[PDB]
Amino acid sequence: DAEFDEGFKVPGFLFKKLFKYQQTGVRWLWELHCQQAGGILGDEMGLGRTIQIIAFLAGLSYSKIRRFEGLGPTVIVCPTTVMHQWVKEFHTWWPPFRVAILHETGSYTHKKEKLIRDVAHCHGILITSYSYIRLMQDDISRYDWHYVILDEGHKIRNPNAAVTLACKQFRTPHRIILSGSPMQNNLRELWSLFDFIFPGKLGTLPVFMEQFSVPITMGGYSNASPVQVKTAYKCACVLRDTINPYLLRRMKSDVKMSLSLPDKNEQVLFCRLTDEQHKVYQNFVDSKEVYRILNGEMQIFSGLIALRKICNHPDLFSGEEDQFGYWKRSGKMIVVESLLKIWHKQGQRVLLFSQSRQMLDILEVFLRAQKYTYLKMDGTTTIASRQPLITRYNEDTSIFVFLLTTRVGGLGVNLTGANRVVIYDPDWNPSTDTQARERAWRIGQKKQVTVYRLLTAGTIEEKIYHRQIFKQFLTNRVLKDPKQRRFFKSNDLYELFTLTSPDPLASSSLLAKMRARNHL
Amino acid sequence: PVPPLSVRPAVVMQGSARNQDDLTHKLADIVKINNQLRRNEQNGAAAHVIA
DNA sequence: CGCTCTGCTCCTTCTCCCATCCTCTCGATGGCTATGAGATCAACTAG
DNA sequence: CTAGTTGATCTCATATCAGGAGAAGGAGCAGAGCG
């Protein structure tokens, strides 16, 4: 067995299956349990982050630590796609636990509240989804849960969403978030995550914004004065120090030599808008609607939707062999044709993502038009058919391409079968495409994988790219290291409607540290 | 207290364009700034912005 | 012997009010505030 | 009974000069008790 401080013994066979970093994780989680604090497992996805929770809870139950005689009833909130995945995981890596699913699919086939009571009495592990948490805050928050793990916990990133409040109604201190990216757009998201795990650490939300978000953000802008750069640097370091104990973020560089992943690539392709595509885009930017949006008369979102659609396909207006969703009508589809052609000739499995769902349909009809055997998976595909679809695609190489909407396509699914990944459509959220591309390059990917980001030069999509770069740098400034380089490329204004196509410390260590921080 | 529709009738012009009363436009401004203040107190905003 | 508590003046805001009723013409202004994905659920539809 | 489909239906996420009159308050100040 493996032994830690007070009484934590995790079975040796279980421990040996783990890696070194996963073992560190188990120790970290138990140290938190000792503190009675929560934490964020911010391991980069694919690093077997889920296995760490299994090991830790197993060890805790096995050690029979002393209200509760070991591990009490616990609730797992995870995105709807991965519930049965978690059930499977508990079942293999530790059969003894009872892992009840709370879902329409489920396995209970009675009233749900009976199941809640059953687990809270027999001390099982109730898996559920964020929806059923939002909808039964009353029922669920009446049973003294022992652990409240949220998988892909970033969904609580909005402090005012209903689901966030519901999740923050749970009472136990042993709150855990498993989130490959616990910060996606701005620090308001970070504060929200910390306020679930550790309700006071970062202060109130107003105070956090005032003290951290404003300064840290202002240090990223190109035009920021150096003074403000240094305030940002200070605040970023303070933030890292504040969040260090409670966030365990192992990127895939401190473990790569100790884990042996294959090569990864991140090529970008600046697609060129075709003639019809160019015409529709050039017209719509010149349209009165865009002009009115620039004047602020109505919502900007409408314009952004329209522009993104245009860059994505001329589905504003539809134009034999020129039916809706025709490939040659849009340049990005031409590029996709060439890439899938060469790759199908390479006998290689592709993973094509799209932020949209109806565009996923146009891609689907395209892949009919070709001889490419695919399998499509979006929010409309049934949840019960979800995990078997993933397993099917991973088990056999007959299925060539795998259309995916990024919202269900990301978020914890393992897709090692695919080799090539192409991100067809950008998002305003860097995390979306990041998790999308990271579906392949995980543990068990025994083959090289490259990531292609298809983008329309000079159009809205490049400006969205700039947004998500600026976001990524902001996340880097506070997660990986505060010495980020300032995003000098753009001023990031509302001129994104244009077409510009190519062509004991002994009190001296303390005071020294203080003087360092306050010298900036 | 926002009055009923009788106190601020939306008179229809010759066509279909429904013109709203002055009270309705003012209540629109009030609800706009009230929602704006509600979100600014709920989410990130400076003290001077809320002021 | 300075401190208070009047209370008089003067100014200064500051607000309100300005007949009834009737006829006609003429000019302006008369807006939406959007989109889409995912999850639940309950209705059918087939098996 | 059981998947599959299909509406609703909800949630969440995405972005930068020819007025006049009167009343109320405040300020300055004389002066009177008075401790």
XYZ file of C-alpha atoms (C1' of nucleotides) in Angstrom:
653
model
C 0.000 0.000 0.000
C 0.840 3.688 -0.201
C 0.592 5.740 2.969
C 0.153 9.448 3.584
C 0.030 11.614 6.626
C -2.749 10.738 8.983
C -4.577 7.642 7.947
C -4.691 7.653 4.213
C -3.817 4.285 2.758
C -4.640 3.734 -0.891
C -4.342 0.122 -2.121
C -0.984 -0.638 -3.623
C -2.301 -2.199 -6.790
C -4.400 0.844 -7.430
C -1.444 3.094 -6.663
C 0.853 1.208 -9.009
C -1.582 1.599 -11.869
C -1.307 5.361 -11.437
C 1.429 7.527 -12.845
C 3.717 9.700 -10.793
C 1.712 12.815 -11.481
C -1.555 11.057 -10.717
C -0.066 9.943 -7.467
C 0.893 13.499 -6.697
C -2.643 14.407 -7.446
C -4.027 11.886 -5.035
C -1.820 13.240 -2.361
C -2.897 16.787 -3.140
C -6.536 15.915 -2.995
C -6.056 14.277 0.323
C -4.161 17.228 1.728
C -7.121 19.343 0.737
C -9.437 16.944 2.465
C -7.388 17.452 5.538
C -7.651 21.197 5.244
C -11.348 20.804 4.398
C -10.910 22.915 1.306
C -11.728 22.371 -2.310
C -9.642 22.522 -5.369
C -9.529 22.614 -9.103
C -7.872 19.780 -10.952
C -6.738 21.833 -13.836
C -4.715 19.133 -15.511
C -4.611 19.526 -19.250
C -7.155 17.193 -20.753
C -6.101 13.722 -21.739
C -3.724 13.536 -18.785
C -6.006 10.981 -17.125
C -7.425 13.583 -14.744
C -10.536 11.538 -13.938
C -8.507 8.526 -12.786
C -7.103 10.650 -9.973
C -10.506 11.156 -8.445
C -11.193 7.470 -8.607
C -7.975 6.700 -6.840
C -8.461 9.288 -4.181
C -12.019 8.411 -3.322
C -11.133 4.750 -3.357
C -8.310 5.331 -0.949
C -10.507 7.419 1.272
C -13.202 4.794 1.471
C -10.680 2.038 1.986
C -8.897 3.866 4.750
C -12.202 4.303 6.572
C -11.254 7.762 7.779
C -13.295 9.169 10.617
C -20.178 11.696 11.275
C -18.870 9.651 8.359
C -17.081 6.320 8.541
C -14.865 6.914 5.537
C -16.628 8.135 2.392
C -20.152 9.453 2.785
C -22.680 9.950 0.024
C -21.181 11.928 -2.809
C -22.471 13.624 -5.931
C -20.746 13.904 -9.286
C -21.977 16.552 -11.661
C -20.637 16.066 -15.135
C -21.722 17.016 -18.612
C -24.435 14.858 -20.045
C -22.169 13.141 -22.498
C -19.833 11.565 -20.012
C -22.053 10.176 -17.328
C -21.869 6.600 -18.398
C -18.204 7.119 -18.995
C -17.768 7.921 -15.327
C -19.920 4.989 -14.369
C -17.709 2.757 -16.433
C -14.658 4.248 -14.838
C -15.777 3.678 -11.295
C -16.834 0.182 -12.181
C -13.500 -0.846 -13.566
C -11.022 1.032 -11.362
C -13.014 0.286 -8.196
C -15.995 -2.064 -8.304
C -17.081 -1.758 -4.664
C -18.772 1.664 -4.919
C -22.378 1.969 -5.956
C -22.544 4.587 -8.695
C -26.111 5.583 -9.330
C -26.903 7.604 -12.440
C -29.491 10.362 -12.159
C -30.895 10.815 -15.626
C -33.798 10.092 -17.871
C -31.732 7.208 -19.161
C -30.546 6.182 -15.731
C -31.120 2.726 -14.359
C -33.626 3.323 -11.568
C -36.974 3.515 -13.337
C -38.840 5.045 -10.403
C -39.174 8.508 -8.970
C -35.812 10.208 -8.745
C -36.153 11.476 -5.201
C -36.269 7.900 -4.022
C -32.912 7.475 -5.717
C -31.521 10.570 -4.075
C -32.599 9.257 -0.715
C -31.240 5.821 -1.502
C -27.815 7.099 -2.305
C -27.784 9.486 0.634
C -28.661 6.585 2.936
C -26.563 3.762 1.474
C -23.672 6.144 0.744
C -23.249 5.685 -2.973
C -21.811 7.940 -5.622
C -24.617 9.794 -7.332
C -23.619 10.909 -10.812
C -25.737 13.656 -12.292
C -25.763 16.428 -14.849
C -25.703 20.114 -14.440
C -29.315 20.309 -15.494
C -30.641 17.973 -12.898
C -28.623 19.990 -10.415
C -30.258 23.185 -11.527
C -33.691 21.621 -11.440
C -33.465 19.863 -8.062
C -31.562 22.230 -5.903
C -34.324 21.638 -3.422
C -34.267 17.859 -3.346
C -30.572 17.367 -3.750
C -29.548 19.953 -1.181
C -31.120 18.161 1.732
C -28.819 15.203 2.279
C -25.408 16.072 3.702
C -23.258 15.219 0.741
C -19.700 14.373 1.487
C -18.115 15.275 -1.842
C -19.434 17.425 -4.610
C -17.163 16.824 -7.585
C -18.018 18.829 -10.708
C -16.518 17.446 -13.847
C -15.798 19.963 -16.512
C -16.586 22.341 -13.873
C -16.059 25.357 -15.976
C -19.766 25.304 -16.675
C -20.106 27.074 -13.354
C -18.098 29.883 -14.765
C -20.987 32.285 -14.789
C -21.578 33.390 -11.267
C -25.156 34.230 -11.993
C -26.278 31.318 -14.003
C -28.856 29.239 -12.281
C -26.670 26.227 -12.405
C -23.954 28.130 -10.695
C -26.110 29.133 -7.824
C -27.464 25.652 -7.502
C -24.005 24.214 -7.361
C -23.024 26.744 -4.764
C -25.863 25.721 -2.524
C -24.039 22.546 -1.516
C -22.732 22.695 2.006
C -19.767 20.417 2.336
C -16.267 21.822 2.103
C -15.124 19.030 -0.097
C -15.940 20.593 -3.370
C -13.808 19.649 -6.354
C -13.734 20.948 -9.933
C -12.177 18.976 -12.701
C -11.706 21.505 -15.439
C -9.145 21.294 -18.161
C -9.423 25.061 -18.572
C -10.591 26.890 -15.552
C -10.517 30.196 -17.277
C -11.634 30.897 -20.673
C -12.576 34.472 -21.235
C -11.753 36.586 -18.235
C -11.080 36.239 -14.619
C -14.694 36.607 -13.628
C -14.785 33.008 -14.629
C -11.933 32.231 -12.340
C -13.554 33.903 -9.387
C -16.632 31.964 -9.999
C -14.797 28.686 -9.930
C -12.997 29.592 -6.779
C -16.133 30.698 -5.155
C -17.469 27.267 -5.584
C -14.476 25.464 -4.318
C -13.388 27.923 -1.670
C -16.031 30.527 -1.030
C -13.924 33.195 0.525
C -10.452 32.990 -0.906
C -10.804 35.502 -3.642
C -13.026 37.995 -2.028
C -16.411 39.144 -3.150
C -16.934 39.420 -6.868
C -16.906 43.184 -6.943
C -13.760 43.323 -4.959
C -12.135 40.690 -7.085
C -12.872 42.568 -10.223
C -11.705 45.832 -8.738
C -8.472 44.381 -7.419
C -7.578 41.730 -9.969
C -9.577 41.693 -13.123
C -9.188 45.297 -14.032
C -5.454 45.527 -13.503
C -4.637 42.186 -14.921
C -6.642 42.907 -17.987
C -5.225 46.343 -18.563
C -1.790 44.949 -18.659
C -2.525 42.974 -21.775
C -3.578 45.702 -24.085
C -1.061 46.945 -26.596
C -1.426 50.584 -25.652
C -1.131 50.079 -21.900
C 1.458 52.201 -20.213
C 4.382 50.335 -18.698
C 3.282 51.337 -15.227
C 0.081 49.543 -15.774
C 1.969 46.623 -17.202
C 3.789 46.306 -13.935
C 0.656 46.590 -11.887
C -0.750 43.801 -13.925
C 2.366 41.814 -13.352
C 2.141 42.303 -9.646
C -1.492 41.431 -9.445
C -1.041 38.403 -11.591
C 1.649 37.093 -9.348
C -0.463 37.721 -6.290
C -3.256 35.845 -7.879
C -1.120 32.892 -8.699
C 0.122 32.829 -5.193
C -3.346 33.004 -3.839
C -4.589 30.213 -6.022
C -1.549 28.012 -5.928
C -2.606 25.578 -3.249
C -6.027 25.007 -4.638
C -5.276 24.530 -8.303
C -3.279 21.528 -9.549
C -2.566 22.310 -13.161
C -0.077 19.998 -14.838
C 0.423 20.991 -18.428
C 1.589 18.435 -20.993
C 5.196 19.509 -20.848
C 6.106 18.603 -17.295
C 4.832 15.079 -17.921
C 5.568 14.493 -21.601
C 8.928 12.830 -21.018
C 7.327 10.876 -18.175
C 4.301 9.907 -20.283
C 5.454 9.645 -23.933
C 2.768 11.323 -26.020
C 3.145 11.504 -29.811
C 3.933 14.571 -31.845
C 1.354 17.332 -32.024
C 0.980 20.090 -34.587
C -1.009 23.336 -34.708
C -0.949 24.511 -38.281
C -3.250 27.339 -39.305
C -4.613 27.908 -42.787
C -5.788 31.381 -43.788
C -8.502 30.492 -46.256
C -9.390 32.840 -49.102
C -13.027 33.757 -49.633
C -14.439 32.639 -52.972
C -16.032 34.935 -55.494
C -19.637 34.339 -54.547
C -18.607 34.232 -50.918
C -16.672 37.442 -51.369
C -19.612 39.109 -53.018
C -22.092 38.234 -50.310
C -19.639 39.300 -47.606
C -18.700 42.535 -49.338
C -22.339 43.371 -49.797
C -23.438 42.600 -46.268
C -20.654 44.631 -44.665
C -21.803 47.512 -46.847
C -25.425 46.841 -45.932
C -27.442 49.332 -43.923
C -27.906 46.732 -41.192
C -24.194 46.637 -40.415
C -24.088 50.425 -40.521
C -26.921 50.623 -38.006
C -25.199 48.095 -35.738
C -22.066 50.238 -35.868
C -24.271 53.102 -34.710
C -25.406 50.987 -31.758
C -29.088 51.241 -32.628
C -29.687 47.531 -31.937
C -27.827 44.458 -30.759
C -24.431 43.667 -32.142
C -25.036 39.951 -31.842
C -27.229 39.863 -34.912
C -24.472 41.322 -37.019
C -21.901 38.951 -35.631
C -24.122 35.982 -36.370
C -24.610 37.179 -39.923
C -20.982 37.796 -40.564
C -19.968 34.464 -39.128
C -22.534 32.699 -41.259
C -21.285 34.435 -44.402
C -17.717 33.495 -43.700
C -18.866 30.020 -42.900
C -20.965 29.419 -46.079
C -23.217 31.657 -48.211
C -26.300 30.464 -46.349
C -27.706 33.980 -46.233
C -28.825 33.284 -49.800
C -28.984 29.912 -51.525
C -28.051 29.518 -55.175
C -28.478 21.174 -60.878
C -25.256 20.689 -58.902
C -25.690 24.025 -57.192
C -28.020 22.875 -54.402
C -27.855 24.226 -50.852
C -24.638 23.472 -49.087
C -22.540 23.205 -52.224
C -18.876 22.857 -51.525
C -17.473 24.919 -54.379
C -19.575 27.892 -53.359
C -17.368 28.518 -50.244
C -13.594 28.526 -50.046
C -13.147 26.816 -46.713
C -15.115 23.894 -48.119
C -12.684 23.745 -51.042
C -9.794 23.537 -48.611
C -11.616 20.849 -46.636
C -12.130 18.935 -49.852
C -8.436 18.982 -50.652
C -7.414 18.007 -47.120
C -9.911 15.168 -46.804
C -8.886 13.971 -50.248
C -5.235 13.708 -49.372
C -5.979 12.225 -45.973
C -8.422 9.642 -47.258
C -5.676 8.675 -49.682
C -3.459 8.389 -46.598
C -5.854 5.887 -45.006
C -6.133 8.188 -42.004
C -8.948 9.028 -39.605
C -9.994 12.661 -39.468
C -11.840 14.629 -36.805
C -13.643 17.665 -38.248
C -15.149 20.164 -35.785
C -17.640 22.986 -36.290
C -18.929 25.523 -33.812
C -22.295 25.485 -35.573
C -24.873 22.721 -35.763
C -26.593 23.527 -39.017
C -23.286 23.891 -40.702
C -22.564 20.468 -39.397
C -25.523 19.459 -41.540
C -24.065 21.079 -44.643
C -20.848 19.252 -43.903
C -22.878 16.076 -43.563
C -24.490 16.424 -46.981
C -21.078 17.182 -48.361
C -19.617 14.035 -46.965
C -22.529 12.276 -48.693
C -21.489 13.963 -51.876
C -18.075 12.455 -51.324
C -17.394 8.828 -50.585
C -16.269 9.647 -47.056
C -17.801 7.389 -44.364
C -18.453 9.540 -41.336
C -20.376 9.541 -38.081
C -21.988 12.811 -36.909
C -22.532 13.755 -33.353
C -24.267 16.871 -32.073
C -26.715 18.029 -29.435
C -29.605 16.499 -31.364
C -28.092 13.032 -31.457
C -29.542 11.112 -28.560
C -27.587 11.069 -25.318
C -27.977 7.328 -24.885
C -26.471 6.805 -28.347
C -23.572 9.062 -27.414
C -21.006 6.932 -25.626
C -21.668 3.954 -27.910
C -21.108 6.247 -30.878
C -17.766 7.381 -29.473
C -16.764 3.800 -28.696
C -17.821 2.666 -32.157
C -15.753 5.293 -33.878
C -12.767 4.466 -31.680
C -13.009 0.688 -32.071
C -12.872 0.325 -35.881
C -11.060 2.250 -38.599
C -13.877 1.913 -41.126
C -15.347 5.232 -40.029
C -13.121 7.841 -41.630
C -14.248 11.323 -40.618
C -16.239 12.267 -37.526
C -18.297 15.431 -37.744
C -18.595 17.146 -34.402
C -20.170 20.159 -32.832
C -17.680 21.565 -30.431
C -20.029 21.848 -27.500
C -20.710 18.125 -27.087
C -17.661 17.177 -29.101
C -15.363 18.668 -26.491
C -15.900 18.059 -22.823
C -14.323 14.819 -21.741
C -14.920 12.465 -24.660
C -11.885 10.403 -25.655
C -11.320 10.242 -29.413
C -7.900 8.692 -29.788
C -9.028 6.849 -32.918
C -8.890 9.942 -35.062
C -5.481 11.169 -36.150
C -6.007 14.419 -38.028
C -8.026 17.239 -36.489
C -9.267 20.301 -38.366
C -11.033 23.175 -36.602
C -13.303 24.447 -39.334
C -14.927 27.418 -37.625
C -13.453 29.715 -34.961
C -15.215 30.657 -31.765
C -15.130 33.589 -29.484
C -14.096 31.209 -26.761
C -10.574 29.864 -27.089
C -11.388 27.056 -24.753
C -13.894 25.618 -27.159
C -11.466 24.995 -29.962
C -8.720 24.081 -27.532
C -10.704 21.208 -26.091
C -11.849 20.322 -29.577
C -8.331 19.906 -30.860
C -7.376 18.189 -27.646
C -9.896 15.392 -28.205
C -7.278 13.449 -30.129
C -3.934 14.245 -28.521
C -4.642 12.313 -25.328
C -3.273 9.286 -23.540
C -3.733 6.313 -25.831
C -3.213 8.307 -29.022
C -0.513 6.027 -30.442
C -0.221 7.995 -33.698
C 0.815 11.496 -34.696
C -1.881 14.172 -34.820
C -1.941 17.630 -36.405
C -4.401 20.447 -35.853
C -5.543 22.630 -38.737
C -7.387 25.860 -37.999
C -9.275 27.002 -41.080
C -9.788 30.759 -41.099
C -10.925 33.430 -43.555
C -8.280 36.080 -44.043
C -9.327 39.657 -43.415
C -12.882 38.786 -42.491
C -14.695 38.543 -39.171
C -13.082 35.216 -38.407
C -9.631 36.744 -38.209
C -10.934 39.304 -35.728
C -12.523 36.552 -33.680
C -9.174 34.864 -33.854
C -7.652 37.947 -32.453
C -10.177 37.857 -29.691
C -9.459 34.374 -28.730
C -5.735 34.997 -28.878
C -6.067 37.934 -26.563
C -8.099 35.765 -24.265
C -5.522 33.039 -24.380
C -2.804 35.399 -23.467
C -4.887 36.630 -20.589
C -5.309 33.129 -19.378
C -1.630 32.489 -19.760
C -0.790 35.560 -17.795
C -2.407 34.059 -14.768
C -2.146 30.341 -15.241
C 1.192 29.513 -16.842
C 3.338 32.531 -16.132
C 2.767 36.224 -15.617
C 5.545 37.300 -18.007
C 3.292 37.137 -21.035
C 4.123 39.304 -24.010
C 1.654 42.083 -24.713
C -0.824 41.398 -27.521
C 0.443 44.076 -29.871
C -1.330 43.034 -33.050
C -4.670 44.823 -32.547
C -6.544 47.483 -30.590
C -9.606 45.227 -30.505
C -12.336 47.673 -31.430
C -15.714 47.497 -33.148
C -14.227 47.758 -36.623
C -14.495 44.006 -37.106
C -17.125 44.476 -39.842
C -14.599 45.031 -42.662
C -13.338 42.931 -45.584
C -9.596 43.235 -46.319
C -8.742 39.995 -48.194
C -5.078 39.149 -48.928
C -3.137 40.558 -51.838
C 9.673 30.637 10.074
C 10.487 33.230 7.474
C 12.947 35.482 9.147
C 11.443 38.870 8.373
C 14.050 39.725 5.874
C 13.023 37.152 3.415
C 9.610 38.604 3.991
C 10.689 42.151 3.698
C 12.809 41.409 0.714
C 9.846 39.795 -0.960
C 7.664 42.708 -0.045
C 10.127 45.187 -1.406
C 10.326 43.207 -4.593
C 6.597 43.181 -5.133
C 6.143 46.820 -4.280
C 9.053 47.966 -6.405
C 7.169 47.112 -9.585
C -45.313 51.979 -10.201
C -45.625 51.592 -13.973
C -49.121 52.686 -15.053
C -51.427 50.574 -17.199
C -51.841 50.844 -20.954
C -54.842 53.181 -20.671
C -52.704 55.911 -19.102
C -50.159 55.541 -21.942
C -52.048 54.286 -25.003
C -50.060 53.051 -27.997
C -51.888 54.827 -30.809
C -51.691 53.218 -34.246
C -50.827 55.599 -37.083
C -52.291 55.509 -40.607
C -50.290 52.359 -41.357
C -49.232 49.640 -38.917
C -46.495 51.568 -37.068
C -47.628 51.629 -33.432
C -46.430 54.848 -31.794
C -45.778 54.599 -28.060
C -46.568 57.254 -25.481
C -43.986 59.524 -23.884
C -44.546 57.684 -20.612
C -43.774 54.381 -22.357
C -40.509 55.705 -23.845
C -39.530 57.013 -20.424
C -40.364 53.697 -18.773
C -38.251 52.038 -21.462
C -35.317 54.221 -20.432
C -36.004 53.461 -16.764
C -36.132 49.697 -17.327
C -33.003 49.855 -19.490
C -30.946 51.647 -16.870
C -32.480 49.567 -14.074
C -31.452 46.309 -15.754
C -28.061 47.825 -16.590
C -27.545 48.811 -12.936
C -28.753 45.385 -11.785
C -26.168 43.594 -13.898
C -23.426 46.090 -13.008
C -24.026 45.457 -9.314
C -24.274 41.715 -9.915
C -21.172 41.492 -12.160
C -17.908 43.390 -12.459
C -18.290 47.157 -12.321
C -16.386 50.008 -10.720
C -17.907 52.013 -7.888
C -17.913 55.161 -10.029
C -19.642 53.253 -12.842
C -22.420 52.156 -10.472
C -22.608 55.738 -9.198
C -15.511 88.736 28.869
C -16.448 85.486 25.722
C -20.180 82.388 24.687
C -24.679 81.651 23.392
C -29.244 82.495 21.292
C -31.722 84.702 19.484
C -33.994 87.921 16.219
C -33.703 91.441 12.283
C -32.211 92.642 7.696
C -30.642 91.656 2.999
C -29.866 88.814 -0.601
C -30.716 84.962 -3.147
C -32.801 81.220 -4.819
C -36.731 79.158 -6.199
C -41.336 78.226 -7.607
C -45.549 79.434 -9.584
C -48.848 81.902 -12.588
C -50.144 84.284 -16.759
C -58.901 84.944 -20.442
C -62.464 82.036 -22.860
C -63.814 79.500 -26.651
C -63.590 78.367 -31.707
C -61.501 77.500 -37.161
C -57.936 76.068 -40.502
C -53.283 74.609 -42.452
C -48.693 72.686 -42.269
C -44.481 69.827 -40.804
C -42.509 66.054 -38.234
C -42.743 61.715 -36.264
C -43.784 58.520 -36.003
C -38.255 51.605 -35.187
C -36.852 46.843 -34.212
C -34.051 45.807 -29.640
C -31.409 38.742 -32.534
C -29.168 33.450 -32.644
C -28.091 29.395 -31.879
C -26.738 24.958 -29.155
C -27.896 21.716 -25.558
C -31.004 19.570 -22.187
C -35.726 18.232 -20.438
C -39.817 16.657 -21.155
C -44.001 15.136 -23.067
C -46.056 13.707 -27.030
C -46.491 10.732 -30.811
C -44.561 7.526 -33.915
C -42.924 3.484 -35.377
C -40.785 -1.070 -33.936
C -42.634 -1.589 -23.591
C -38.840 1.167 -26.385
C -36.070 3.832 -29.256
C -36.658 7.691 -32.470
C -38.503 11.847 -33.707
C -40.397 16.418 -32.868
C -42.024 20.457 -30.814
C -41.764 23.634 -27.205
C -39.332 25.402 -23.858
C -35.889 26.655 -20.970
C -30.899 28.012 -20.097
C -26.558 29.795 -21.377
C -23.161 32.052 -24.196
C -21.135 35.154 -27.335
C -19.514 41.785 -27.778
C -17.819 46.911 -27.248
C -33.228 91.837 -23.798
C -39.749 94.294 -21.820
C -41.891 89.143 -15.746
C -43.522 89.730 -11.389
C -44.824 88.377 -7.128
C -44.317 85.937 -2.962
C -42.290 82.553 0.128
C -37.988 79.942 2.225
C -33.011 79.657 3.496
C -28.968 81.345 4.566
C -25.665 84.819 6.104
C -24.232 88.729 8.577
C -24.652 91.023 12.583
C -26.491 93.840 16.741
C -27.345 92.967 21.106
C -28.833 90.863 25.336
C -28.298 87.678 29.086
C -25.342 85.136 31.364
C -21.902 81.860 33.379
